[PDB]
């Protein structure tokens, strides 16, 4: 295995990471910082030099989400959001004109702010959850297209959600956080439920990724990892793992899937030097790496590439580190 | 009586403290997962508990003896207890409501029909009804002498809390939107009604 | 000032005033611990307040008594009344009531008049 | 042991007997004078009263009354059944 060169990009303080994402065609690392810094720097394992950054005055930042991966605007536009009731367009054509996305009617001032939004595949749909039903509107027209009435009674501005690897047209999930309930909803017809089923919020309020589906692995706050197939969601509603393993003595604060849905990644942020990789469907732990003998820190964010070979690990000290895998 | 407090940690320990002096009095450890609901009879005799490892713990309050335990098919999220009839209903992960007679130490009732998770449920003061609030916008009255659903209230703002008044008059419901608390009226001047379920969407 | 209570224990003519004060568990009879008493067989009868409710119970207090009057049987019956009365007097004022209800239940169930002194008043029938 | 008594209560079997103490404690005992319970003093500010007491006819309860504007309920074990305030 190849140990790459250590990273050099760091915050002046000890700070967190808004989002980790990748350019789909080139190796490039996008970074949103909390001081209104929208920077992106080139990575090869040898390079960390800054391509460009963005600091728009009269607009702070609160969350970061990489704008849609395939319509035509993966490589031109990035929509970023702050504490105000609109969000921003960043143009690599660099034009970078602000398109004030305050154009939701009568329901704009109902959330905290634009803090959590998930764009769909072909950008004709964009999903937003409240404490809470979901708005679905265009990222290029500004009109409220529709919105599915996800009723909710324990919805707490649910932390992360995902149009699945079987296509957004097939179904689309809702991870109802603080109990982790799952609501499969169909995009082809607004108003029809695919199915709902219990996922455990007794263990795991932790973030979860969608595999592919092929595997649906979930993590707990106890080092107890579970493997849930997509067709374990059919009746009866309780899931059963084919293998449920302990590898962490402490909390599991991170989860990632590979693009083929056959590699799980997990990490924590309570004790320094702790990160683990999992193979699928062989259920193997990658033992050559990662261990506690590598500098890992208190890991907040982690991401695989669209190729999934590389691996970005952000700490609470400002160092984000990539690895070919 | 207002003398002792019963707390259940995320690791499984349940301690009994004295509310007058704030002292450690007693500690238990049987659950290996988080304790989701603790109660005791009004006679201060038998102490019940429910955990995420499926465990229903039955204790003697006078001694420290394990009186009983029952294992269910689903972990339990909440415990509401009716004191003057010694029954307690339990919201499980299998979308069913397990009402339990405590003296028998036996599972006696279980309710089905809720398509989604229930966050709030409470006993009628006469012990005949349990109106529950679920994520599928269902606020259902449950009649215990028949064991079936007799009423379902379908709303647009689902109630986060349903709470029976001590007198048989009012209902305290807190909702998802709206900082206020909707109070609901049982008519209670008459009824002989027994009519049934699913209606308007 | 320390938390402290004082009571008494009476046999036929024996007087034994107790001084149940706070501390670490010294329990003395006029200068002397319990295990030296002589009667030496009636040592077990004054062992009894250690025993009927559980042994420990004493790590926060201290005991000192003194006896004037009586006989060697009468002197030991005076103090062992006063120990149990002196014990619950601390639970009367500082500790909660229901603990003391558990003490007196363990006391009264075996009671050899541990909580009441002897008084004799005859009458023809 | 304590307590000049105003209020006395009997069982109609000749075995159980309740005494009101010189305070709000209510103690009950057998014909072999072994004290079963002693009940805590009277609360309810608008000082202590123990004026009337009764052993119920089923033999499973007693009712206690003072003059502090309520009434108290007990069983043969230690506990309070109910407390009804006027």
UniProtKB/Swiss-Prot annotation, chain A:
GO terms for cellular component: 90S preribosome; nucleolus; nucleoplasm; Pwp2p-containing subcomplex of 90S preribosome; small-subunit processome. The keyword Nuclease does not apply. It is found in: Nucleus, Nucleolus. GO terms for biological process: endonucleolytic cleavage in 5'-ETS of tricistronic rRNA transcript (SSU-rRNA, 5.8S rRNA, LSU-rRNA); endonucleolytic cleavage in ITS1 to separate SSU-rRNA from 5.8S rRNA and LSU-rRNA from tricistronic rRNA transcript (SSU-rRNA, 5.8S rRNA, LSU-rRNA); endonucleolytic cleavage to generate mature 5'-end of SSU-rRNA from (SSU-rRNA, 5.8S rRNA, LSU-rRNA); maturation of SSU-rRNA; RNA fragment catabolic process. Keywords: Nucleus, Phosphoprotein, Repeat, Ribonucleoprotein, Ribosome biogenesis, rRNA processing, WD repeat. WD repeats lie at residues 12-51, 56-93, 213-238, 247-288, 294-325. It comes from the Eukaryota. Its main location: nucleus. The keyword Phosphoprotein applies. Coiled coil: none annotated. Present with 9570 molecules/cell in log phase SD medium. Belongs to the WD repeat UTP18 family. Involved in nucleolar processing of pre-18S ribosomal RNA and ribosome assembly. Interacts with snoRNA U3. Interacts with MPP10, UTP21 and UTP25. Component of the ribosomal small subunit (SSU) processome composed of at least 40 protein subunits and snoRNA U3. This is U3 small nucleolar RNA-associated protein 18. The lineage of its organism: Eukaryota, Fungi, Dikarya, Ascomycota, Saccharomycotina.
Curated annotation (Swiss-Prot), chain B:
Interacts with snoRNA U3. Interacts with MPP10. Interacts (via WD repeats) with UTP18. Component of the ribosomal small subunit (SSU) processome composed of at least 40 protein subunits and snoRNA U3. Involved in nucleolar processing of pre-18S ribosomal RNA and ribosome assembly. Present with 2020 molecules/cell in log phase SD medium. This is U3 small nucleolar RNA-associated protein 21. It is found in: Nucleus, Nucleolus. The WD repeats are grouped into two tandem seven-bladed beta-propeller regions. It comes from the Eukaryota. WD repeats lie at residues 1-27, 35-71, 76-111, 113-154, 156-194. The chain holds residues 471 to 671 of 939 of the full protein.
Swiss-Prot record, chain C:
Disulfide bonds: none annotated. It is found in: Cytoplasm. One of its GO terms (biological process) is translational initiation. Its main location: cytoplasm. The modification Phosphoserine is found at residues 32, 59, 74. There is a cross-link at residues 28, 45, 57 (Glycyl lysine isopeptide (Lys-Gly) (interchain with G-Cter in ubiquitin)). One of its GO terms (cellular component) is cytosol. InterPro entries: Ribosomal_Su5_D2-typ_SF, Ribosomal_uS9, Ribosomal_uS9_CS, Ribsml_uS5_D2-typ_fold_subgr. Keywords: Acetylation, Cytoplasm, Isopeptide bond, Phosphoprotein, Ribonucleoprotein, Ribosomal protein, Ubl conjugation. The modification Phosphothreonine is found at residue 68. It holds the Pfam family Ribosomal_S9. PROSITE patterns: RIBOSOMAL_S9. One of its GO terms (molecular function) is RNA binding. Component of the small ribosomal subunit (SSU). Mature yeast ribosomes consist of a small (40S) and a large (60S) subunit. The 40S small subunit contains 1 molecule of ribosomal RNA (18S rRNA) and 33 different proteins (encoded by 57 genes). The large 60S subunit contains 3 rRNA molecules (25S, 5.8S and 5S rRNA) and 46 different proteins (encoded by 81 genes). Belongs to the universal ribosomal protein uS9 family. PANTHER family: RIBOSOMAL PROTEIN S16, RIBOSOMAL PROTEIN S9. Present with 33800 molecules/cell in log phase SD medium. This is Small ribosomal subunit protein uS9A. It comes from Saccharomyces cerevisiae (strain ATCC 204508 / S288c).
UniProtKB/Swiss-Prot annotation, chain D:
Transmembrane segments: none annotated. It comes from the Eukaryota. Disulfide bonds: none annotated. Coiled coil: none annotated. It is found in: Nucleus, Nucleolus. WD repeats lie at residues 1-39, 47-84. Present with 16700 molecules/cell in log phase SD medium. Interacts with snoRNA U3. Interacts with MPP10. Component of the ribosomal small subunit (SSU) processome composed of at least 40 protein subunits and snoRNA U3. Required for bud-site selection and cell separation. Also involved in nucleolar processing of pre-18S ribosomal RNA. Belongs to the WD repeat PWP2 family. This is Periodic tryptophan protein 2. It comes from Saccharomyces cerevisiae (strain ATCC 204508 / S288c) (Baker's yeast). The gene is PWP2. The chain holds residues 514 to 616 of 923 of the full protein.
């Amino acid at each position: 295995i190849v140990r790459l060169k250590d990273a050099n990009a760091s915050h002046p303080s000890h700070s967190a990471i808004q989002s980790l994402s990748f350019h789909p065609s080139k190796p490039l690392l996008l970074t949103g910082g909390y001081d209104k810094t929208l920077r992106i720097y080139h990575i090869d394992g040898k390079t960390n030099h800054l391509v460009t950054s963005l600091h728009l005055v009269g607009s702070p930042i609160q969350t970061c989400t990489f704008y849609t991966s395939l319509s035509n605007q993966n490589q031109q536009n990035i929509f970023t959001a702050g504490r105000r009731r609109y969000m921003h367009s960043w143009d690599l054509s660099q034009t970078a004109k602000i398109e004030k996305f305050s154009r939701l009617y009568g329901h704009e001032s109902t959330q905290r702010s634009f803090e959590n939004f998930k764009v769909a595949h072909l950008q004709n749909s964009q999903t937003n959850s409240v404490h809470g039903w979901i708005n679905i509107l265009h990222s290029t027209s500004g009109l409220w297209l529709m919105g599915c009435k996800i009723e909710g009674v324990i919805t707490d501005f649910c932390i992360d959600y995902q149009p699945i690897s079987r296509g957004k047209f097939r179904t689309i999930l809702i991870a109802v956080n603080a109990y982790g309930e799952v609501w499969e909803f169909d995009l082809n017809k607004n108003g029809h439920v695919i199915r709902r089923w219990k996922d455990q919020g007794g263990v795991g309020i932790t973030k979860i990724q969608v595999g592919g589906n092929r595997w649906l692995a979930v993590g707990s706050e106890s080092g107890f990892v579970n493997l849930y197939d997509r067709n374990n969601a059919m009746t009866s509603s309780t899931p059963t793992p084919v293998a449920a393993l302990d590898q962490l003595t402490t909390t599991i604060s991170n989860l990632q899937f590979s693009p083929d849905g056959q590699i799980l990644c997990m990490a924590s942020r309570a004790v320094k030097d702790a990160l683990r990789l999992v193979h699928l469907p062989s259920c193997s732990v990658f033992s050559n790496w990662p261990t506690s003998g590598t500098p890992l820190g208190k890991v907040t964010s982690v991401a695989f590439s669209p190729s999934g070979g590389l691996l970005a690990v952000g700490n609470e000290q400002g160092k984000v580190r990539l690895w070919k895998l | 009586c207002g003398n002792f407090g019963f707390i259940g940690s995320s690791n499984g320990s349940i301690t009994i403290y004295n509310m007058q002096s704030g002292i450690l009095r007693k500690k238990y450890k049987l659950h290996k997962r988080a304790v989701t609901g603790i109660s005791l009879d009004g006679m201060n005799r038998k102490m019940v508990s429910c955990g995420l490892d499926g465990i229903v713990g039955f204790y003697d309050f006078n001694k420290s003896t394990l009186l009983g335990k029952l294992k269910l098919d689903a972990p339990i999220t909440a415990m509401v207890y009716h004191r003057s009839s010694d029954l307690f209903a339990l919201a499980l992960d299998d979308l069913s409501i397990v009402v339990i007679d405590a003296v028998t130490q036996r599972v006696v009732r279980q309710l089905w029909g809720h398509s989604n998770r229930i966050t709030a449920f409470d006993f009628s003061p006469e012990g005949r009804w349990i109106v529950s609030a679920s994520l599928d916008s269902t606020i259902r009255t449950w009649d215990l002498p028949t064991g079936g659903c007799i009423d379902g209230i379908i709303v647009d703002n689902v109630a986060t809390n349903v709470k029976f008044s001590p007198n048989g008059d009012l209902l305290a419901t807190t909702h998802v939107t709206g900082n206020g608390i909707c109070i609901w009226t049982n008519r209670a001047q008459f009824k002989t009604v027994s009519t049934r379920t699913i209606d308007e969407s | 000032a320390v938390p402290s209570v004082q009571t008494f224990g009476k046999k036929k003519s024996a007087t034994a005033v107790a001084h149940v004060k706070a501390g670490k568990g010294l329990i003395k009879v006029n200068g002397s611990p319990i295990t030296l008493v002589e009667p030496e067989i009636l040592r077990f009868k004054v062992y009894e307040p250690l025993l009927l409710v559980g042994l420990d119970k004493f790590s926060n207090i201290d005991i000192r008594v003194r006896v004037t009057g009586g006989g060697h049987v009468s002197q030991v019956y005076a103090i062992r009344q006063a120990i149990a009365k002196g014990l619950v007097a601390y639970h009367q004022k500082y500790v909660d009531e229901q603990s003391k209800n558990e003490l007196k239940k363990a006391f009264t169930s075996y009671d050899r008049t541990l909580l009441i002194a002897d008084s004799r008043r005859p009458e023809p029938k | 042991v304590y307590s000049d008594v105003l209020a006395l209560s009997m069982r109609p079997d000749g075995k159980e007997v309740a005494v009101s103490t010189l305070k709000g404690q209510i103690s009950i005992f057998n014909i072999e004078d072994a004290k079963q319970v002693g009940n805590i003093d009277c609360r309810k500010d608008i000082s202590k009263f123990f004026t009337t007491i009764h052993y119920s006819f089923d033999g499973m309860a007693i009712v206690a009354g003072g003059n502090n504007n309520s009434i108290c309920l007990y069983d043969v074990p230690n506990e309070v059944l109910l407390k009804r305030f006027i």
